[PDB]
Design a protein that fits this description.
It is a single chain. The chain is of the alpha+beta class. The protein has one domain: Cytochrome P450 (Cytochrome p450). About 45% of the residues lie in helices and about 10% in strands. The chain is built from 16 helices and ten strands. The strands form three sheets. Strands 1-2-8-5-3 form a five-stranded mixed beta sheet. Strands 4-10-9 form a three-stranded antiparallel beta sheet. Helix 7 packs across helix 8 and helix 8 packs antiparallel against helix 9. Bound molecules: protoporphyrin IX containing FE (HEM) and calcium ion (CA). Protoporphyrin IX containing FE (HEM) binds next to helix 11, helix 12 and helix 16. It holds the Pfam family p450. GO terms for molecular function: cholestanetetraol 26-dehydrogenase activity; heme binding; iron ion binding. Its EC number is 1.14.15.15. It catalyses: 5beta-cholestane-3alpha,7alpha,12alpha-triol + 6 reduced [adrenodoxin] + 3 O2 + 5 H(+) = (25R)-3alpha,7alpha,12alpha-trihydroxy-5beta-cholestan-26-oate + 6 oxidized [adrenodoxin] + 4 H2O.
């Protein structure tokens, strides 16, 4: 709950339907908020400038060991599995540097024609007369197929791969979500050992070959962790980019008709969807190495911090009229992909998938409409994520 003039629900009740008035309430009246979450307390930065500068704040680290007393941490491993997103320099830098050599913005762009055939394929298999769940049938699909094309997952293994991927996004997130984790992990290892014998154009083959101006390469353990990471960070988030962006246009006809007339605005549109309804609403947990101070509030060392990306993006100090959806905007400096050394590695691929999935969906089905009321929509009860479990839509006649 909120503590200001008017008390909004936080991470319960109405929050999950629409967290934005609660974010507006926090930015205004309680910008650095200690939340009594079930697991442990966590501080929430909602103001733009706070979040923006917290990302590049050295006193904020990804090492969870900062919560344990100084002597007790000289014993514990830093991370369970070597994913760079869990690491600080110089350990993160070494992995980021290597991945970046092969996972280039160029490869990200060269998938564009391939992505289109996935969307068009999926669109071609959707009935003129709905109702159809646009999430499970379309938005759930594009990000996982694209990731296969990037990694080079054999066409045979792709049904099995997407099957396990759905568990992570929308399923029984308890023990059943972790069952698919070990299955996807195992498959990718065996895949890497197959890629060693038979190489290809794909990124997994590319990553195996990457040395540097020191002869440093990715170890087996690091390779498969990276493969697993690209999947987790690149699936659910991009799904919800699609989910949220489609929903944004459906609820704003004025803007849907702007895009209809000028389909080149899609690139500008996807930018403002990431702002207007940030799919990753909360940044992965950070830790205080020492007393930081934001908007008057001093977070003591050893505390868990959370950066309100969704909140910081609708901040009026940064963005004029921050609650109005304008796809023609010239936005610059949103915190939806993050900031600093942890900036979204697949930022450009995400944008591509976004523009293709959304742009082609509307061009192919100009009569698209929600097949249920706005309030009937169920949103996932996830802390980090802002997105739908189901989105019933009526497709309409295909345009030829
Ligand atoms: C679809 C919209 C997406 C959003 C809103 C998003 C958001 C983010 C954010 C905020 C971070 C920084 C996390 C932090 O600093 O704690 C991040 C990191 C990352 N993302 Fe994305 N992401 C998206 C799509 C993707 C895609 C498609 C990929 C595929 C490669 C991807 C891969 C990664 C990776 C590998 C990192 C770790 C960066 C590092 O630690 O150096 N993301 N993402
Ligand atoms: Ca098989």
């Amino acid at each position: 709950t909120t503590t200001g003039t008017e008390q909004h629900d936080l991470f319960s009740g109405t929050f999950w339907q629409n967290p934005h008035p609660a974010y507006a309430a926090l930015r205004a009246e309680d910008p650095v908020r200690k939340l009594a979450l079930p697991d442990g307390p966590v501080w929430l930065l909602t103001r733009y400038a706070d979040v923006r500068e917290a990302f590049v704040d050295p006193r904020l680290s990804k090492d969870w060991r900062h919560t344990l007393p100084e002597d007790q941490r000289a014993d514990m491993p830093a991370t369970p599995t070597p994913m760079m997103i869990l690491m600080d320099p110089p350990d993160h830098t070494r992995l980021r540097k290597l991945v970046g050599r092969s996972f280039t913005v160029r490869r990200m762009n060269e998938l564009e024609p391939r992505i289109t055939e996935i969307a068009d394929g999926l669109l071609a298999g959707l009935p003129t007369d709905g109702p159809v769940d646009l999430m499970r049938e379309y938005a759930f699909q594009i990000p996982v197929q694209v990731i296969c094309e990037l990694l080079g997952v054999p066409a045979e293994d792709r049904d099995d791969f997407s099957a396990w991927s759905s568990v992570l996004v929308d399923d029984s997130p308890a023990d059943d979500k972790n069952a698919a984790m070990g299955k996807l992990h195992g498959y990718l290892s065996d895949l890497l050992e197959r890629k060693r014998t038979e190489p290809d154009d794909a990124l997994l083959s590319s990553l195996l070959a990457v040395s540097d101006e020191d002869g440093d390469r990715l170890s087996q353990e690091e390779l498969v962790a990276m493969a697993m990471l690209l999947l987790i960070a690149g699936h659910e988030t991009t799904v919800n980019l699609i989910g949220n962006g489609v929903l944004a246009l459906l609820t704003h006809p004025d803007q849907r008709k702007l895009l209809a007339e000028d389909p080149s605005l899609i690139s500008s549109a996807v930018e403002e969807f990431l702002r207007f309804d940030s799919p990753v609403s909360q940044a992965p947990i950070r830790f205080t190495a020492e007393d930081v101070t934001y908007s008057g509030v001093t977070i003591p060392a050893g505390e868990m911090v959370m950066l309100g990306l969704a909140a910081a993006n609708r901040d009026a100090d940064w963005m004029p009229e921050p609650d109005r959806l304008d796809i023609t905007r010239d936005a610059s400096g949103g915190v939806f992909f993050g900031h600093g050394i942890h900036f979204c590695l697949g930022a450009q691929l995400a944008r591509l998938e976004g523009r293709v999935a959304i742009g082609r969906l509307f061009a192919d089905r100009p009569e698209l409409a929600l097949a249920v009321g706005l309030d009937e929509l169920v949103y996932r009860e996830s802390t980090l994520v802002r997105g739908l479990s189901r989105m019933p839509v009526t497709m309409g006649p295909r345009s030829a």
